[PDB]
Amino acid sequence: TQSPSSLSASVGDRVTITCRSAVAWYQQKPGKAPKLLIYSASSLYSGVPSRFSGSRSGTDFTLTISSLQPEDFATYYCQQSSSSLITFGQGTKVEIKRTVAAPSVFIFPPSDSQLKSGTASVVCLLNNFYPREAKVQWKVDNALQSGNSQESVTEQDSKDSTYSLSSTLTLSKADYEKHKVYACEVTQGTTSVTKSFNRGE
Amino acid sequence: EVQLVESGGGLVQPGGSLRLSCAASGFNFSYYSIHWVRQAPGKGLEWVAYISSSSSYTSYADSVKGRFTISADTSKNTAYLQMNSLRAEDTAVYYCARGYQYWQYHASWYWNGGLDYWGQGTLVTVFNQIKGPSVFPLAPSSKGGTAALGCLVKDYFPEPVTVSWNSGALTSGVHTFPAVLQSSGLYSLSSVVTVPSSSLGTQTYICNVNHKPSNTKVDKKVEPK
Amino acid sequence: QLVESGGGLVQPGGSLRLSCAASSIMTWFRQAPGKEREGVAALYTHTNTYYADSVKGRFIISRDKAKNMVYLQMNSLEPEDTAVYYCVPVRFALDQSSYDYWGKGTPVTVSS
């Protein structure tokens, strides 16, 4: 049923994933079919290398990669049976640990184009940061916002191992022309960065 | 020397019907079960159904029990999934995988053979309504160091839309966000790129939005405001 | 109708005894993931034991007519032995394509 959702490790690290019938483990890389890695809790499937193992620490099933290799960053799924039913776990993505990087923040006012059809989308971009965890907050003339913004986040960059994140404030055109100052705030840890613009400048 | 090959599927209206194929080569067919496993875009795997030799040996998950039907023909070593009553949550990539003939019977605290061989997958998407996207510029924030510019791809349905920059010529520094579903029931995303501020007056930046569900291509020139 | 029992979890180097219950002809086959059902041991009733190369005298297949049973004594087990186990030229006698009816099989996991 359940597994630790997200994991950062380095090449060389020892890595252990947990799962809530004996379990089978599958590996999936983006855009490819899953492969079977471990069946019957602890049996290595054909061609799977030896740094992989499985175990039952108490009542939970584990998969261990004793020494993580570049080709091992992927998603991992455990799979059980119950009656005539089969179920896969939520999945666990194993990501590349890397040095902390501050996002460069860009704020974009709605285009004149979008405005003159009566909608206002303000777009905040956090670019090339690590780790993934951040808190975004929209400000409109200094009043914080709620219920009117959405967020989305890229997978890890294949070059630098960073993430990017977009946040979109959707306002009516009218609610937009009523106000002057627009700011999104990015908190990561002890640092909190605000970027803004004055409408019409 | 064992293969599963998948086929059929793609675009259908909800309240339509579609039939997936899994033709298998390189092994004694009747000694195994064939399973269907689907994965919604950017989501986990979901076991759907299986069948063995004897056609009484079938089962389905609670999400598809009455809407789908699994069959098999041992004459040619193929197996089918007929899908009916096609709601939204049916849009997914659909794999077929091979397991043991008596997997249910063998299932125990120490045993689980899992599914060894898998097909390449086939995309199945149900387009209830269709809207093409509007595209608006995210105009360069500065004029120097680095500048960020982008395209807001807005109010389309259903997924997905692809985004290139300069028709594939610019790829470095590009970030295309996964779409979000707005409260309006329409999808939206942004694509951005970072470039050197000094190229703003000498280089052109166009974003290319493609939306197959509506056969729309939008090309948008992002200029400094 | 053939029914098998005896399967379980064993560690490398441990032993296991698989049984078979009947209702003319006796053999043991196995099938691991990604691999094809491989013959392991045959017993010619009307005299004789034959074995695959991959069972370097580790396995013994006895019989009991009185109880109508056939056994497989698996010794010195290795991870490579993990499989479900299932119940004519003497040259084509460890071959799948030679037997009328099988059992449903009993799973054996050999795992440290």
Q: Please report, for the domain that includes residue A63, its CATH number.
A: 2.60.40.10
Phi, psi angle pair for B172, to nearest 5°: -60, 130
- Please tell me the distance from the alpha carbon of residue A99 to that of residue A130, in angstroms, as a whole number: 7
- Other C-beta atoms closer than 10 Å to the C-beta of B79 total 27
Pairing status of strand A43-44 against strand A181-188 = unpaired
Q: How long is chain A?
A: 201
User: Is C105 part of the contact surface with chain B (CB cutoff 8 Å)?
Assistant: yes
Tell me, yes or no, whether B10 and B118 share the same domain.
yes
DSSP sequence for chain A: -----EEEE-TT--EEEEE----EEEEE-TTS--EEEEETTTEEPTT--TTEEEEEETTEEEEEESS--GGG-SEEEEEEEETTEEEE---EEEEE----BPPEEEEEPPPHHHHTTTEEEEEEEEEEEBSS--EEEEEETTEE--SSEEEEEPPPPTTT--EEEEEEEEEEHHHHHT--EEEEEEEETTEEEEEEEETT-
Residue A131 preceded by cis peptide, ω within 30: yes
Task: Provide the shortest C-alpha distance from residue B34 to chain C (in Å).
Answer: 14
Token pair belonging to A142: 């200094």
Tell me, yes or no, whether A86 and A120 share the same domain.
no
- Please tell me the distance from the alpha carbon of residue B70 to that of residue A122, in angstroms, as a whole number: 48
- Tell me which residue has tokens 């608006």: B136
User: Is A170 part of the contact surface with chain B (CB cutoff 8 Å)?
Assistant: yes
Nearest to A145 by CA among A125, A113, A169: A169
Interior CA angle at A24 toward A20 and A29, to 5°?
A: 100
Task: Provide the shortest C-alpha distance from residue A162 to chain B (in Å).
Answer: 11
SS3 content of chain C, % helix, strand, coil (to 5): 5, 40, 55
Nearest to B159 by CA among B123, B192, B135, B207: B123
User: Is B57 part of the contact surface with chain C (CB cutoff 8 Å)?
Assistant: no
CA C55 from centroid of its chain's CA atoms: 11
- Please tell me the distance from the alpha carbon of residue A182 to that of residue A176, in angstroms, as a whole number: 10
Element (H, E) at B104: helix B103-106
Nearest to B100 by CA among B111, B92, B91, B90: B111
Q: Which domain holds residue B165?
A: 134-221
Pairing status of strand B11-12 against strand B122-126 = parallel
What number of CA atoms fall less than 13 Å from residue A199's CA on the CB side? 19
Task: Provide the shortest C-alpha distance from residue B121 to chain A (in Å).
Answer: 7
Test B114 with C33 for CB contact under 8 angstroms. yes
In the 8-state DSSP scheme, what is residue B111? -
Q: Residue B99: closest CA among chain C residues belongs to which residue?
A: C33
Pairing status of strand C9-10 against strand A92-96 = unpaired
CB contact at 8 A, A76 and A64: no
Tell me, yes or no, whether A91 and A109 share the same domain.
no
Interior CA angle at B110 toward C30 and C59, to 5°?
A: 35
CB contact at 8 A, B78 and B72: yes
- Please tell me the distance from the alpha carbon of residue C43 to that of residue C59, in angstroms, as a whole number: 12
- Please tell me the distance from the alpha carbon of residue A148 to that of residue B24, in angstroms, as a whole number: 50
Q: How many domains does chain A have?
A: 2
Tell me, yes or no, whether B93 and B165 share the same domain.
no
Tell me, yes or no, whether B111 and B185 share the same domain.
no
- Please tell me the distance from the alpha carbon of residue C106 to that of residue C71, in angstroms, as a whole number: 13
Residue C33 preceded by cis peptide, ω within 30: no
Instruction: Among B66, B98, B126, identify where a domain stops.
Output: B126
Q: How many domains does chain C have?
A: 1
- Please tell me the distance from the alpha carbon of residue B46 to that of residue B31, in angstroms, as a whole number: 24
Q: Please report, for the domain that includes residue B189, its CATH number.
A: 2.60.40.10
Token pair belonging to A28: 């999936």
Tell me, yes or no, whether B7 and B101 share the same domain.
yes
Strand partners, B156: B187
What is the biggest distance separating any 2 CA atoms in chain B, rounded to whole angstroms? 71
Q: Which domain holds residue C24?
A: 2-110
Tell me, yes or no, whether A127 and A70 share the same domain.
no
Exposed/middle/buried for residue C80 (C-beta within 10 Å: 0-12, 13-18, 19+) = exposed
Q: Which domain holds residue A35?
A: 6-96
Q: How many domains does chain B have?
A: 2
Nearest to B130 by CA among B155, B152, B162: B155
Tell me, yes or no, whether B140 and B39 share the same domain.
no
Task: Report if residue A1 sits inside a domain.
Answer: no
- Resolution, given in Å to one decimal, reads 2.5
Tell me, yes or no, whether B103 and B120 share the same domain.
yes
User: Is A168 part of the contact surface with chain B (CB cutoff 8 Å)?
Assistant: yes
Tell me, yes or no, whether B177 and B148 share the same domain.
yes
Q: Which of residues 54-93 of C touch B (CB under 8 A)?
A: 84
Structure-determination approach: X-ray
